[PDB]
């Protein structure tokens, strides 16, 4: 199931999440890829950040080398660091990526962030740069067929603004991709991008990973949220499926980590079922305006 992108390529709406922390060994990226392709997903999501694109593009390979996947039938997406944000370093970080993924192209290629930071992962540094150059040294890259869409990550309406009212653009942003989830349900931003043609993409939809780095212990945990547990059991599937079931509805493609194999495979059940119009209601009234991500922590 894929939604049709304002550049007329189709995007999977489950993708697959691939971050885990630096203490979890760069095996595991590879094994629970395979596993994910196994179970039916065939949107992957990765970032140079994330330290683990020769692994999943491993695990993409392999399973396009045995025959359980055409390279047509996966769609890859990487993201630009923002040490990578003035134009000339942008398809060099690209190529960089295809390099470590060894393939040919990405489906898609994400501006991971709008901040900006000193050429070099975190110098400690910013730098002002143009996102709206930024943008044009990507739109190259989809000229030049190593990325077949390109989008951005972490922007807000005014920033993506920028990007639409850009004197002379070529290409609008195919998405967004921005936290999203019952707690933080974006519903202004996601009627924005709706009538601009832009996807939003839901990251830490299943309410994130709460790594010590950045989730405060004491903060409300997503699916122990007695509505998304009252739904659950109602159709007798498990919170994290409502909170994946609530996106798709709305019109959202949304991400789910996991490397865990019953839960691997338990994620592509979101397509088995269907909320009510009621039950949307229930989960619209769960907005509290909760970021589990700060980017000005990290
Ligand atoms: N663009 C950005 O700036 C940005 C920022 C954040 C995230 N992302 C992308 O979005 C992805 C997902 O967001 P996220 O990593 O925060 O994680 P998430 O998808 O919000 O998942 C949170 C946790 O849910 C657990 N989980 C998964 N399926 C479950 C199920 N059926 N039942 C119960 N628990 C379940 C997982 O643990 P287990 O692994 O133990 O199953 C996982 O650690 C990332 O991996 C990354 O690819 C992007
Ligand atoms: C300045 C800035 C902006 C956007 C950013 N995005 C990420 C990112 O993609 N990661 C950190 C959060 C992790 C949450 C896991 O639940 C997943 C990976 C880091 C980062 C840093």
């Known amino acids: 199931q894929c939604v049709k992108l304002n550049d007329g390529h189709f995007m999977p709406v489950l ?8 203490e979890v060994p760069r095996s595991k990226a590879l094994e629970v890829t395979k596993l994910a392709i196994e179970a039916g997903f065939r949107h992957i999501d990765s970032a140079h950040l994330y330290n683990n694109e020769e692994q999943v593009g491993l695990a993409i390979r392999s399973k396009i080398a045995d025959g359980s996947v055409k390279r047509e039938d996966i769609f890859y997406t990487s993201k630009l660091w923002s040490t990578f944000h003035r134009p000339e370093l942008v398809r060099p970080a690209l190529e960089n990526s295809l390099k470590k993924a060894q393939l040919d192209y990405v489906d898609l290629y994400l501006i991971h962030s709008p901040m900006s930071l000193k050429p070099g992962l975190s110098p400690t540094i910013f730098d002002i740069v143009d996102l709206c150059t930024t943008w044009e ?12 869409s390109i989008g951005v990550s ?6 993506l603004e920028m990007i639409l009212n850009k004197p002379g653009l070529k290409y609008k942003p195919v998405c967004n991709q921005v936290e999203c989830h019952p707690y ?6 996601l009627d924005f991008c709706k009538s601009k043609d832009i996807v939003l993409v839901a990251y830490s939809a299943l309410g994130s990973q709460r790594d010590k780095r950045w989730v405060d212990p ?8 007695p509505v998304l547990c009252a739904l659950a059991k109602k159709h007798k599937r ?10 798709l509805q709305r019109g959202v493609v949304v991400l789910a980590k996991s490397y865990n194999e019953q839960r691997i495979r338990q994620n592509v059940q979101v397509f088995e079922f269907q909320l009510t119009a009621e039950d949307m209601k229930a989960i619209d009234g769960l907005d509290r305006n909760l970021h589990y991500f700060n980017s000005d922590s990290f």
């Open 218 to 225: 004491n903060s409300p945990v997503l699916l122990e949220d």
């Open 137 to 148: 040294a990507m739109e190259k890259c989809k000229d030049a067929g190593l990325a077949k």
């Open 238 to 247: 498990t919170p994290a499926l409502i909170a994946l079931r609530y996106q």
């Open 15 to 22: 993708g697959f999440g691939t971050y885990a922390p630096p």
């Open 154 to 159: 972490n922007f807000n309406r005014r920033q």
């Open 184 to 189: 933080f349900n974006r519903s202004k931003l």
